[PDB]
Amino acid sequence: LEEEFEINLSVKHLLELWDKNLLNTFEIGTFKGLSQIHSYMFKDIFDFNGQIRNVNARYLKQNLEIIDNMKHDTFDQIIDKYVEMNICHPFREGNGRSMRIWLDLILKKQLNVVVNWTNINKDEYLLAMINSLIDSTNLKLLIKNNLTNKITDRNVYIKSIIKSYEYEGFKINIK
Amino acid sequence: NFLEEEFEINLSVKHLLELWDKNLLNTFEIGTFKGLSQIHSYMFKDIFDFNGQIRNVNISKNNSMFCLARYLKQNLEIIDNMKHDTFDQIIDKYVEMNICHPFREGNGRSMRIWLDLILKKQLNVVVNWTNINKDEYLLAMINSLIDSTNLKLLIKNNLTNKITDRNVYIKSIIKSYEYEGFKINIK
Amino acid sequence: ANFLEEEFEINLSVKHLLELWDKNLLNTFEIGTFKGLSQIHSYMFKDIFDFNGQIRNVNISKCLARYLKQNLEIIDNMKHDTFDQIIDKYVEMNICHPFREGNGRSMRIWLDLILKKQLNVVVNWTNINKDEYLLAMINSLIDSTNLKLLIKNNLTNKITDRNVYIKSIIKSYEYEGFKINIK
Amino acid sequence: EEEFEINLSVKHLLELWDKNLLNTFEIGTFKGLSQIHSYMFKDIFDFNGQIRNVRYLKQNLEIIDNMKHDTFDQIIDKYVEMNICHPFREGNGRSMRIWLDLILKKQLNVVVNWTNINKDEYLLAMINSLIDSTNLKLLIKNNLTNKITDRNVYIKSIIKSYEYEGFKINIK
């Protein structure tokens, strides 16, 4: 009955990332990139932390190399990389969490902005993300509108942990 | 509460788009009910677990006292054994296979992709589904139980030789769901 | 006996709505009241159903016991000045469901008319693809935020352009799942 | 326990092309159609040429007669709007399709080849007509014939015309 620990923990792990200044370390827009965020984030919560799942499996490797080579220079390219990376869903558990950080990290490099997830309504996102298998448009507009250049605002970052955590379940308060 | 899993619909569409992208429908058996299975398989991957499976083949294993579970195997032996070289022959195959209803769900959405793959091999054309308004086709299909002429005639007038245009394939999928009464739109 | 050709009913009711526009009638209906919603439902399912304008359980007359006319006045007694009061009304009129069929194809016209004489706007539904609207409304019966936040962002002031009204009709049917053709 | 009455009306029609009386009726007006219904259901219905009582329709009939009928589009758009008005009770617009093969014959040197126009296709275009005439336009268009004086054309436009409204007769 320690699911709330595991949540407070990963959230801790995610702050250490901001504070010790470690998240500018991470490889931008690779799988090796997401791998390291997932690794640290879940260090003390999953034995499979950072490791590609096995069970429903060998052509998964295959997809990631394909994605790895997708250019990520314009915005349209980056969200194209997000969509396909999220479509691949290469971890046993909590992919979408590691991938919204992974995303913020790419944009922050390439267009000097992050995603102000606290404007991005939970329902509208979930929805535009399902349309994203077919049609990644709805998601493009939604994220473009809610960019901010405040790429160094530990607040935006705190509040972004919260809406990211809210989309995948989990409530928690900042502290 | 009421959570709509539009996911299931949207997912099946990406399974269909996958087939095209990973040159996979070009590797499926033509006009045979294995070929239609291999489509309706990949297409409902995680969604249902009667993928390629015929109605009443899992309930013939333990509970097999389905004295007539072989009626369906019987009529697919037939439809497989129909020819599929001429346009006549293929729209007759399509008509029977859609009268058979081998799958539980995948009701004919499979059938249309399976058809376009026949015309695409045999006649080097696909249907240009887009100018086939829902009103027309649905009717074509009801007359088609009795007389396949109205269907044959609608599909005659709306062919295209754009058998490799990935957008034609996509305009197909949009139209295909439109007929089965789902919106969806693709990039 | 396949009368897919009683798609005639779907089509007739659409060109019923079209006669509301091209006989300047829809201006003429009571706004923001169940009599207003009744005149729309009444006119537009004219030839089709005969339970047209009539509340469910109003024809049975001769016993029952209960009546939803109670919630109906309650709803008619709501304000509709501000956007947040209108949507508020709209949500609650659709949770009634006075009619048997005609659901809120009627309601999505009775609404466009409320925004049109209160805030001089209509919904540009063309930019509200189905997924959102249905989700917005399913939320509405506990929290109406999604639907306000949704319709606020899809208002036009093009409140007299014919085609706009036509594109209203097309998406409104599309939401119920009828597709139909344009002009 | 009915029948026969179709025979009698097809008789008024053979006569109406033989006694040369089609070319003498008003074109593109109610009065015109009213004189085609009247001749057609004369020894049958008591209301042949007569507007239905089961009001604002006397108005709607002007606004149809008001619409021009010069170009192809204007002829159909009148034909749809007229048919939508369904002026007579029974009799409907079997005469309307005649009344239409006048308005084309006169204005654009053509009539409709209704044999090429399968029943389903037609009925479907005509339902959707009262929203989107489009289908009816590109349907009537690709089945126009310039043989306006042919009798076999006309004979076939009264075979195919009855079939549509359901009544199947061959006679000679």
Enumerate the domain spans of chain B.
6-180
CATH topology of domain C8-176: Fic-like fold (1.10.3290)
CB pairs under 8 A between A and B: 23
Residue A103 carries which side chain, given as an amino acid letter? L
Q: In the B/C pair of chains, how many CB contacts fall below 8 A?
A: 25
CATH code of the region A3-167: 1.10.3290.10
Cα distance between residue D83 and residue D68, in whole Å: 16
- C103 sits in the region (left: phi over 0; alpha: psi -120 to 50; else beta) called left
State the chains in contact with D (3 or more Cβ–Cβ pairs under 8 Å).
Answer: B, C
D80's CB contacts (< 8 A; 6+ apart) are D129, D130, D133, D136
Q: How far is CA D109 from CA D22, D25, D133, in A?
A: 15, 17, 22
Amino acid at A171: K
Q: How far is A98 from chain C (nearest CA, A)?
A: 26
**Pairwise CB contact (< 8 Å): B135 & D120:** no
What number does CATH give the domain B6-180? Answer: 1.10.3290.10
Q: Which residues of chain A are at the C interface, by a Cβ-Cβ cutoff of 8 Å? A: 121, 123-124, 127, 130-131, 138
Task: Give the C-alpha separation, A152 to D156, whole Å.
Answer: 82
DSSP D26: P
Pairing of strands B126-127, A114-115: unpaired
CB contact under 8 A, B153 and D118: yes
Experimental method: X-ray
Nearest-CA distance from C125 to chain B in Å? Answer: 15
- Residue C25 Cα distances to A167, B172, C16, C18, C99, angstroms: 46, 41, 11, 10, 21
Neighbours of chain A (3+ CB pairs under 8 A): B, C
B139 CB neighbours in chain C (<8 A) are: 4-5
**How many CA atoms does the CB half-sphere of B141 hold within 13 Å?**
18
Beta carbons of D39 and D16 less than 8 angstroms apart: yes
A29 membership: H or E segment, kind and range: none
* List of chain C residues whose C-beta atoms are within 8 Å of the C-beta of residue D127: 5, 7-8, 11
Contact assignment for A138 to C149 by CB distance below 8 Å: no
Query: Chains B, C in contact: 3+ Cβ pairs under 8 A?
Result: yes
Chain breaks in chain C (C to N over 2.5 A) after: 62
Give the three-class secondary structure for D56.
Answer: coil
Any alpha helices (H) in C22-154, and if so which ranges? 34-44, 69-76, 83-96, 107-118, 130-140, 145-152
3-state secondary structure chain B: CCCCCHHHHHHHHHHHHHHHHCCCHHHCCCCCHHHHHHHHHHHCCCCCCCCCCCCCCCCCCCCCCCCCCCHHHHHHHHHHHCCCCCHHHHHHHHHHHHHHCCCCCCCCHHHHHHHHHHHHHHCCCEECHHHCCHHHHHHHHHHHHHCCHHHHHHHHHCEECCCCCHHHHHHHHHHHHHHHCCCCCCC
Domain D5-165 in CATH 1.10.3290.10? The answer is yes
Residues of D in contact with B136 (CB under 8 A): 124
* Closest by Cβ to A121, choosing from C129, C131, C149: C149
Q: Which residues of B touch C138 (CB under 8 A)?
A: 1-2, 4
Other CB atoms within 10 A of residue B138 CB: 15
